[PDB]
Amino acid sequence: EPLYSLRPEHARERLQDDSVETVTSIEQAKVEEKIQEVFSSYKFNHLVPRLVLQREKHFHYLKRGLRQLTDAYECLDASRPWLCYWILHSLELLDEPIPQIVATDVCQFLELCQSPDGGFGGGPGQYPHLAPTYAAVNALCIIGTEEAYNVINREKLLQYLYSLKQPDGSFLMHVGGEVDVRSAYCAASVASLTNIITPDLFEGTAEWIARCQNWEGGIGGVPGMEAHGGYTFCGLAALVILKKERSLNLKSLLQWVTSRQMRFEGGFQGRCNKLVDGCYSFWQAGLLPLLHRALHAQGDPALSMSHWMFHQQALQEYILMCCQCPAGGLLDKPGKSRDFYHTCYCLSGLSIAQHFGSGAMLHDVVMGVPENVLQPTHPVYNIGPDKVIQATTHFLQKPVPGF
Amino acid sequence: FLSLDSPTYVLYRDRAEWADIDPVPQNDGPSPVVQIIYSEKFRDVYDYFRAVLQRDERSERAFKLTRDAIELNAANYTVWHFRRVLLRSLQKDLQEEMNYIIAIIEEQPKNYQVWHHRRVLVEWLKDPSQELEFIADILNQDAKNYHAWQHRQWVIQEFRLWDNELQYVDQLLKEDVRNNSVWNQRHFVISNTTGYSDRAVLEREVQYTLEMIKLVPHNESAWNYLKGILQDRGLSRYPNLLNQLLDLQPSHSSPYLIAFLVDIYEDMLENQCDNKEDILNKALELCEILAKEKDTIRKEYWRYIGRSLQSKHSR
Ligand SMILES: CCN(CC)C(=O)Oc1ccc(C[C@@H]2CN(Cc3cncn3C)c3ccc(C#N)cc3CN2S(=O)(=O)c2ccc(OC)cc2)cc1
Ligand SMILES: CC(C)=CCC/C(C)=C/CC/C(C)=C/COP(=O)(O)OP(=O)(O)O
Numbered sequence: 001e002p003l004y005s006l007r008p009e010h011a012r013e014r015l016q017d018d019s020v021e022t023v024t025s026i027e028q029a030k031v032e033e034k035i036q037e038v039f040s041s042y043k044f045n046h047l048v049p050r051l052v053l054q055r056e057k058h059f060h061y062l063k064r065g066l067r068q069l070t071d072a073y074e075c076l077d078a079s080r081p082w083l084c085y086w087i088l089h090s091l092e093l094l095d096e097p098i099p100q101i102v103a104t105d106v107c108q109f110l111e112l113c114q115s116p117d118g119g120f121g122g123g124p125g126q127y128p129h130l131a132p133t134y135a136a137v138n139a140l141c142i143i144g145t146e147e148a149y150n151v152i153n154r155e156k157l158l159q160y161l162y163s164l165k166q167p168d169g170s171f172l173m174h175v176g177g178e179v180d181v182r183s184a185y186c187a188a189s190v191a192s193l194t195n196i197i198t199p200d201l202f203e204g205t206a207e208w209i210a211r212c213q214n215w216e217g218g219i220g221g222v223p224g225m226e227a228h229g230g231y232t233f234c235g236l237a238a239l240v241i242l243k244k245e246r247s248l249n250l251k252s253l254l255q256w257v258t259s260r261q262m263r264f265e266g267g268f269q270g271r272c273n274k275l276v277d278g279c280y281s282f283w284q285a286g287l288l289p290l291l292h293r294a295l296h297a298q299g300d301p302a303l304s305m306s307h308w309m310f311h312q313q314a315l316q317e318y319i320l321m322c323c324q325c326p327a328g329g330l331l332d333k334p335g336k337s338r339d340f341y342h343t344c345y346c347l348s349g350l351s352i353a354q355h356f357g358s359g360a361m362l363h364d365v366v367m368g369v370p371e372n373v374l375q376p377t378h379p380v381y382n383i384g385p386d387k388v389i390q391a392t393t394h395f396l397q398k399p400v401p402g403f
Numbered sequence: 404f405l406s407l408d409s410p411t412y413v414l415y416r417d418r419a420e421w422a423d424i425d426p427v428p429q430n431d432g433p434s435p436v437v438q439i440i441y442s443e444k445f446r447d448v449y450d451y452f453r454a455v456l457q458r459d460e461r462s463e464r465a466f467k468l469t470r471d472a473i474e475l476n477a478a479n480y481t482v483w484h485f486r487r488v489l490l491r492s493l494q495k496d497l498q499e500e501m502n503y504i505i506a507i508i509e510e511q512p513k514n515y516q517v518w519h520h521r522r523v524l525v526e527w528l529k530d531p532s533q534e535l536e537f538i539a540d541i542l543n544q545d546a547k548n549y550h551a552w553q554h555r556q557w558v559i560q561e562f563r564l565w566d567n568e569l570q571y572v573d574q575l576l577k578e579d580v581r582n583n584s585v586w587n588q589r590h591f592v593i594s595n596t597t598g599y600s601d602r603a604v605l606e607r608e609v610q611y612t613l614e615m616i617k618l619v620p621h622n623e624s625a626w627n628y629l630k631g632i633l634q635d636r637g638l639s640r641y642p643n644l645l646n647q648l649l650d651l652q653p654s655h656s657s658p659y660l661i662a663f664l665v666d667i668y669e670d671m672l673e674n675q676c677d678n679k680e681d682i683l684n685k686a687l688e689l690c691e692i693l694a695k696e697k698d699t700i701r702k703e704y705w706r707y708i709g710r711s712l713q714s715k716h717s718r
């Protein structure tokens with residue numbers, strides 16, 4: 001009883017290296033040693049385990065970062081809209097309101113980032129790129145006012161997306177950039193939310209994405225490349241937006257993700273024979289809701305009506321025990337430093353693991369104190385489902401540009 | 404020329420060669436958000452980069468400035484784009500630029516911009532001759548670097564350099580048989596050369612994997628490879644496979660072996676196999692062995708597999 005990771009038999013889930021040591025096994029055993037110490041610390045210190053999400057610490061870390069960042073974030077100077085999205089999403093998940101004037105200041109900042117030729121860049125005067133375009137549009141939707149919606153130039157945005165579209169179905173990340181399954185997701189996310197999808201915008205795109213699924217079951221960044229959770233999320237989520245989820249072998253995909261949850265740590269790895277992280281609480285585990293909605297759309301009557309097809313409890317235990325910084329913020333794994341990215345995706349993953357939804361059926365699992373329960377997140381867009389519905393509704397008022 | 408970590412580095416604002424140009428400070432608004440408190444050095448380089456960018460100054464001094472800007476934030480895609488404009492306008496020698504990107508990737512190997520720049524150089528030069536060896540040096544430091552594998556695949560495909568790659572694979576597999584990137588490269592090489600729809604290759608591949616599985620039974624990579632190359636023909640098409648796995652249980656058992664058994668049974672049942680309602684119970688016995696005892700992190704998947712099989716292969 002009652003925390004899965006502290007049960008005596010859990011010790012049997014440690015790595016079996018068959019007496020054959022390689023780089024891979026040495027590195028996995030190091031991680032498992034650190035994590036076991038975390039799991040054990042309660043017993044060694046003779047205290048009852050109590051899992052608490054340090055909301056107030058996280059809130060103050062976020063509140064501050066929304067305004068000001070140390071020079072440690074110099075590496076993210078071409079990604080400032082990412083920071084707006086990470087932090088705003090984290091606040092939304094923690095159920096912390098956004099002052100009308102931080103809202104207006106974010107709006108103004110993102111307008112400075114918008115390019116006269118469409119899309120958003122990483123900061124004022126930077127050229128546009130699909131990653132900061134995605135982040136900007138998501139941030140604006142989280143804010144959700146008429147001001148925030150009005151920032152986006154839908155006409156230019158559509159021009160920009162066409163400028164990136166390739167003959168084989170793919171998109172460039174930016175002009176003169178290269179192509180990637182990330183770009184298809186960024187394009188489909190922004191297009192669908194703002195209602196600018198034309199009949200030919202995504203012609204070939206599902207087939208290009210389907211070419212990225214490999215012998216493993218997952219999706220690589222381009223055809224031929226190793227399966228990875230980041231790319232598998234982008235690929236599946238884009239196909240859900242395009243209604244082409246059917247193009248994939250969903251069954252090999254399901255077997256692949258589920259295989260990515262670590263038996264000992266409880267969190268997810270990004271690819272096979274690599275390390276648990278942190279942000280894959282969202283990128284890997286967020287596949288399960290998408291696979292549920294897909295397999296259900298095909299009439300799969302073996303589907304649970306209460307749980308996603310991963311160990312929700314073990315993931316919550318990983319995040320809560322191993323991924324919180326005491327000063328606020330969340331992280332990849334013990335011994336790493338906090339950051340706003342892991343704060344975003346660790347909390348997004350926590351939320352997914354807490355909330356099951358499937359039409360009529362709703363069911364929560366909240367490990368630790370009941371205060372730990374977060375607001376839900378939409379598995380396709382990773383903003384609140386209310387922000388999505390809301391946003392999709394307001395831009396349906398307008399015609400797809402051209403019309 | 405003047406390195407950013409030279410003891411004698413001077414800010415651009417104190418350089419005489421730059422006096423004619425007024426820096427352009429970042430326009431962040433009256434009340435900024437996510438405002439990063441840049442070091443003096445970063446802010447100084449970038450104020451001058453904005454100036455040359457806005458004037459579209461296509462000069463040797465601008466070219467050298469992009470170097471410092473890149474070093475300060477190599478993720479800055481706007482600087483890389485301008486550097487490429489400058490490489491072309493100034494007619495810079497691209498082999499020297501190849502020397503530069505080599506040094507940069509070597510320092511910051513997990514960055515998209517850096518590998519994309521290299522690829523652009525190789526396509527400008529139509530010259531892949533340094534690539535496999537350079538890539539092998541990066542992989543000697545991190546054998547799982549995703550960009551390095553992606554660039555390798557690209558070079559091999561584009562310039563048809565397939566002939567020595569399976570040998571490279573073999574080397575790395577011996578170094579670390581758990582390296583999933585190397586198992587993936589194996590599949591990539593074989594399926595683009597001889598293919599797997601061939602009996603001589605399909606076999607040797609299987610015998611090699613079973614041989615790897617035997618040496619280290621809890622390496623999931625070899626198991627996923629094995630499954631991967633047999634499964635789209637259908638596992639039940641190979642009837643000896645069952646037996647040969649149902650023979651190393653007490654010797655080499657794992658949740659991987661047991662789960663492979665379930666995949667075999669699953670395909671058997673999907674085709675109208677012999678002893679139908681019979682092989683089904685074997686599978687369920689295993690599923691619940693997995694969901695309750697042997698692989699409980701997947702309890703929700705294995706209970707769902709128990710179900711769907713029940714649902715379509717029972718009564
Ligand atoms: C476009 C979708 N969004 C929403 C804005 C998004 O965040 O997507 C990603 C953008 C970039 C990335 C790649 C990296 C990932 N990392 C490094 C990392 C994460 N987990 C383990 N590691 C080693 C990080 C890490 C920290 C932060 C913060 N804050 C951000 C990233 C985002 N990027 S990164 O290439 O920009 C980067 C940044 C800092 C860094 O030094 C730690 C290493 C990489 C992944 C997802
Ligand atoms: C829309 C968008 C931009 C989505 C992001 C997609 C995403 C998370 C991509 C990851 C790319 C990748 C192979 C990282 C490997 O890093 P690593 O080798 O350090 O880590 P790993 O060992 O966990 O693979």
Ligand SMILES: [Zn+2]
Binds near residue numbers: 279280332
């Ligand atoms: Zn991470």
